[PDB]
Amino acid sequence: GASKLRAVLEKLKLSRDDISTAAGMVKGVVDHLLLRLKCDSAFRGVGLLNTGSYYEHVKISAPNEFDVMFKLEVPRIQLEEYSNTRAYYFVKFKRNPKENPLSQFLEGEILSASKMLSKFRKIIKEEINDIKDTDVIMKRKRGGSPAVTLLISEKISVDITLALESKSSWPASTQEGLRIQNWLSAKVRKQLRLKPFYLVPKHAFQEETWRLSFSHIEKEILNNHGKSKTCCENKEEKCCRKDCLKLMKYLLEQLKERFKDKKHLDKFSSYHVKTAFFHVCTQNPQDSQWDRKDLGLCFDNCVTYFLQCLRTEKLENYFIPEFNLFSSNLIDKRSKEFLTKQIEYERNNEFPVFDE
Numbered sequence: 001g002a003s004k005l006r007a008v009l010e011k012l013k014l015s016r017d018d019i020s021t022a023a024g025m026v027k028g029v030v031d032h033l034l035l036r037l038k039c040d041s042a043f044r045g046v047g048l049l050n051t052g053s054y055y056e057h058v059k060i061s062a063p064n065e066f067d068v069m070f071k072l073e074v075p076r077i078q079l080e081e082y083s084n085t086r087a088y089y090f091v092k093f094k095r096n097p098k099e100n101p102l103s104q105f106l107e108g109e110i111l112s113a114s115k116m117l118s119k120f121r122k123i124i125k126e127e128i129n130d131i132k133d134t135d136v137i138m139k140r141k142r143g144g145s146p147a148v149t150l151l152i153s154e155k156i157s158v159d160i161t162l163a164l165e166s167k168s169s170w171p172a173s174t175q176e177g178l179r180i181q182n183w184l185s186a187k188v189r190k191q192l193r194l195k196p197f198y199l200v201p202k203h204a205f206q207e208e209t210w211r212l213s214f215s216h217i218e219k220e221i222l223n224n225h226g227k228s229k230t231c232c233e234n235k236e237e238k239c240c241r242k243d244c245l246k247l248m249k250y251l252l253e254q255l256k257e258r259f260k261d262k263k264h265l266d267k268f269s270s271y272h273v274k275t276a277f278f279h280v281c282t283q284n285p286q287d288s289q290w291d292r293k294d295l296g297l298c299f300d301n302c303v304t305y306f307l308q309c310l311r312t313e314k315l316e317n318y319f320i321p322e323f324n325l326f327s328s329n330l331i332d333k334r335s336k337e338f339l340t341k342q343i344e345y346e347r348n349n350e351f352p353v354f355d356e
């Protein structure tokens, strides 16, 4: 029963001190990079974005892998959507009132992600080989985001993403997103959409496009997650929302590990499970629908909705509802069918993947 789930959560806590030590290694190298980056013309306004739920600027994505986002204030943003994709954009600047720090990165009117990315890499790689006395090595993956993957003395991998910050109103494609009004309130949705949004270098084939990112809002709604403002602040108001997301992420990690002989699940990520989880929070807005005592039922709610998304081949980005993370363009039909069969078996047999 749910004792099996509570036992899984207890076992995960046993790794708590290890990944808090590794993150202490990440925080030291990232801070070292930020000081170098700020000395550069284009990057003087570079900073650490708040994306982690346990360490302020260091996000845990999976065992021993960390995500970090470097934000750069960029005024006078002008967005042009790339070919109805809803999430990808060309970046232009509001017509010249003197020249911007990023002038070096233009191609005609468009801000070149590859130009900007190349200088980001160079400055960081300088601080990998200028201080070759430290155990860090740098891999470069395909997509522009993550831009740089540092390996710290091996076993500790950290992805570093550059993110443009825009303080402008969110783009039209987000107008019907962030459907939190019945859960976190209209007042909160208004406040959240007054915050900046972010753009990361990413291509859709390849162009000089940027993709929207809302990692800071995601962190804020996960940490301040109750209909009650005092959810999880006292013994009378303990919900299981965070634990359900933890278990869903762990479920997917464990299945991918077991299906490593063929790797049919490599296109699925913790972002898919987190997005599905936010939809289930919208579906079940009351804290009484997440009572600690109901961990088993609540996890079943989360899994059942994830299964529905797989079977219908539809998982809307929580901020951009017309952006389908499960479209056949992104994940082929056979992979979604394959994951459906495995999750369906696990749900129908009380999750034996969690057995000891």
Ligand SMILES: O=C(O)Cc1csc(Nc2ccc(F)cc2)n1
Binding pocket: 001, 002, 003, 004, 005, 295, 296, 297, 299, 300, 350, 351, 354
């Ligand atoms: O048996 C209980 O304690 C109550 C209950 C109701 S539904 C449910 N689901 C459930 C899901 C996964 C699991 F590994 C174990 C249980 N648990």
Ligand SMILES: O=C(O)Cc1csc(Nc2ccc(F)cc2)n1
Binding pocket: 087, 211, 212, 213, 215, 269, 271, 272, 317, 320, 323, 325
């Ligand atoms: O969101 C992340 O940082 C990681 C991740 C994994 S899959 C994915 N797709 C995605 C697509 C459009 C979008 F606007 C936001 C996200 N993003």
Ligand SMILES: [Zn+2]
Binding pocket: 225, 226, 231, 232, 237, 238, 239, 240, 241
């Ligand atoms: Zn809570």
